[PDB]
Amino acid sequence: FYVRKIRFEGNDTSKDAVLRREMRQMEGAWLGSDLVDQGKERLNRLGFFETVDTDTQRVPGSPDQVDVVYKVKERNTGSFNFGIGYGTESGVSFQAGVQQDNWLGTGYAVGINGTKNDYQTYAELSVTNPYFTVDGVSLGGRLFYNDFQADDADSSDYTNKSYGTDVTLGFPINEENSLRAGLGYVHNSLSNMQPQVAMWRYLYSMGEHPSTSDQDNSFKTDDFTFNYGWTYNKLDRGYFPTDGSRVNLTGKVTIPGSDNEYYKVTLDTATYVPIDDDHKWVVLGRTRWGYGDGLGGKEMPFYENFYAGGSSTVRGFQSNTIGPKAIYFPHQASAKDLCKSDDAVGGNAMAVASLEFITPTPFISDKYANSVRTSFFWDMGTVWDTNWDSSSGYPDYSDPSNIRMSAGIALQWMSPLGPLVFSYAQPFKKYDGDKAEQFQFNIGK
Numbered sequence: 103f104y105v106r107k108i109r110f111e112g113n114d115t116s117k118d119a120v121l122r123r124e125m126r127q128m129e130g131a132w133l134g135s136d137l138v139d140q141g142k143e144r145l146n147r148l149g150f151f152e153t154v155d156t157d158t159q160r161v162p163g164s165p166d167q168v169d170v171v172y173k174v175k176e177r178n179t180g181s182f183n184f185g186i187g188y189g190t191e192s193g194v195s196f197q198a199g200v201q202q203d204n205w206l207g208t209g210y211a212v213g214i215n216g217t218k219n220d221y222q223t224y225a226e227l228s229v230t231n232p233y234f235t236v237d238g239v240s241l242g243g244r245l246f247y248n249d250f251q252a253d254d255a256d257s258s259d260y261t262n263k264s265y266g267t268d269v270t271l272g273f274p275i276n277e278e279n280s281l282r283a284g285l286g287y288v289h290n291s292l293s294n295m296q297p298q299v300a301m302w303r304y305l306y307s308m309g310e311h312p313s314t315s316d317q318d319n320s321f322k323t324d325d326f327t328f329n330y331g332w333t334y335n336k337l338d339r340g341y342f343p344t345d346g347s348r349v350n351l352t353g354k355v356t357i358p359g360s361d362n363e364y365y366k367v368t369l370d371t372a373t374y375v376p377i378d379d380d381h382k383w384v385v386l387g388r389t390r391w392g393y394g395d396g397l398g399g400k401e402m403p404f405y406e407n408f409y410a411g412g413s414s415t416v417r418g419f420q421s422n423t424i425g426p427k428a429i430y431f432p433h434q435a436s437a438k439d440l441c442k443s444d445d446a447v448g449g450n451a452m453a454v455a456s457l458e459f460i461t462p463t464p465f466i467s468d469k470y471a472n473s474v475r476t477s478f479f480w481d482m483g484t485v486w487d488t489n490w491d492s493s494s495g496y497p498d499y500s501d502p503s504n505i506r507m508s509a510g511i512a513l514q515w516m517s518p519l520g521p522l523v524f525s526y527a528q529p530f531k532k533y534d535g536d537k538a539e540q541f542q543f544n545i546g547k
């Protein structure tokens with residue numbers, strides 16, 4: 103018996119000539135099991151396969167010829183994910199999931215994700231194909247479920263169960279630049295809303311005028327959107343930058359087939375300026391911007407509002423407190439006129455800025471220095487409601503000018519339990535109903 107052809111079945115991503123080198127069986131030359139078995143074990147030495155087996159196939163219409171088939175399977179192990187942590191005004195957060203790129207030689211990248219915290223429960227099904235022509239260009243699919251409990255996020259009472267879809271293109275415009283664009287669908291099921299002037303104005307705008315009696319009432323919507331974005335990143339290191347910037351522009355727009363008629367746009371900038379030779383003293387320039395409104399006829403959805411205050415925006419203020427507050431019709435909590443509250447609602451417009459100064463950590467003169475970052479900050483921000491008709495006795499929520507600020511210290515440490523962050527700030531400039539939260543902490547999400 104003699105070998106005619108040495109075939110490689112399941113040679114998906116590994117090259118043909120590569121696998122031909124790791125086996126010394128000559129074509130045309132006499133077949134020997136000794137040379138077949140040695141090629142299989144050498145293919146395992148490469149370690150790019152889970153299972154390698156030999157199968158000598160007989161040639162059709164030949165009493166002598168035999169084809170040597172090496173049936174191989176590449177071990178593309180999927181990504182497994184799990185996450186636990188704490189944070190002031192977010193509480194105990196659970197972030198677990200699982201993604202697979204090899205599924206099922208399509209060759210799309212499929213994944214199932216999940217999130218659970220005090221106010222939000224999220225779940226998604228992802229499907230996207232990278233390469234996809236010239237560069238890592240993509241067309242993505244997203245099937246999501248979301249449950250938001252406004253009372254638990256420090257806002258005025260309501261509950262919004264969301265179901266929707268995403269069809270997003272991801273053009274990599276540079277090594278440091280990305281540009282995404284997509285289509286969307288979103289079903290929002292608003293329920294148990296607490297009556298106030300700020301959210302009843304949008305329901306009166308949508309033509310769905312409800313009751314002012316008590317909490318129980320529904321409002322289901324269906325929307326189709328065009329999503330766009332851009333991400334610039336020139337940060338020297340990932341998690342503790344010293345030089346470079348990061349810009350994120352992510353705005354959406356409603357299609358004329360949707361129930362809601364609105365547009366919303368956001369901008370987030372981070373600028374790191376090192377003032378030395380060893381990048382020990384650095385100045386961080388962070389800014390966050392947001393704007394949206396009811397594009398013709400009606401007002402923008404209050405679930406799409408902008409919020410400020412807390413660990414990620416303005417420290418010294420409890421989560422979501424900065425900006426407008428709810429003006430209730432009956433009573434507030436556990437009367438025959440309007441009731442102004444301390445409970446935030448957010449706004450269609452917000453501007454946040456922050457000047458931070460990172461210094462070397464005192465008391466630590468070691469190689470443990472690149473683990474902890476000490477910073478002194480000055481945080482500033484405001485959120486307002488464009489459509490708040492002051493034509494009253496209640497505060498002008500349409501006024502941008504009342505910008506609230508804080509000063510404080512910050513500590514970041516790559517702790518044995520994961521990323522640890524704690525801040526302590528004084529809210530030196532506060533306005534009517536703004537709630538303070540001096541010490542704020544966040545552990546490894």
